[PDB]
Design a protein around this ligand. Sequence first.
Ligand SMILES: O=C(O)C[C@@H](NC(=O)c1cncc2c1CCC2)c1ccc(F)cc1F
Length: 167
Amino acid sequence: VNSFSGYLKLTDNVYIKNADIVEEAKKVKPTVVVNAANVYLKHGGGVAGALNKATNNAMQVESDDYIATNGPLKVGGSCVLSGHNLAKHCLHVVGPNVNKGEDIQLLKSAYENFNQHEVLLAPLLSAGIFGADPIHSLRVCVDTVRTNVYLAVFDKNLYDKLVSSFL
Ligand SMILES: O=C(O)C[C@@H](NC(=O)c1cncc2c1CCC2)c1ccc(F)cc1F
């Protein structure tokens, strides 16, 4: 039993809700919140810009130190950093950005990072300003993640479309 409330169950291990991931994180304080990161951990917009704003820019300060030490992530890769006031940990995961020409096959590799964590709160990788089809992102998620994932979809219209079209 966990504290996630109001989710629709899609499969044995995947759940979905129309919610602002920022507000959902502040209430649940999950062990792991997933960020829709880029390789530079520049949290300017989308989910990343919103999460970073909620930390009063502390996520960005920590991220800049991480990059100065380690260099950029790989597309499809991840790193674990602090969750600040939102969660114990933040798993920064880089899905391919279609508006940059990155290979969509890398989306499965990106979701594989979730399997290193028993329970996560997450957005749909490569959705939104990353330019991929969110319906496809949900399919790859369900077919790749085996741990317990709670998906927050900001747009109510998109949430309804994702549920109504889910196979
Ligand atoms: O933001 C992403 O990277 C991906 C995804 N974000 C969220 O669902 C989300 C969840 N919680 C809080 C917030 C967001 C967005 C900003 C604040 C997304 C958003 C809108 C859209 F039209 C498509 C889409 F895929």
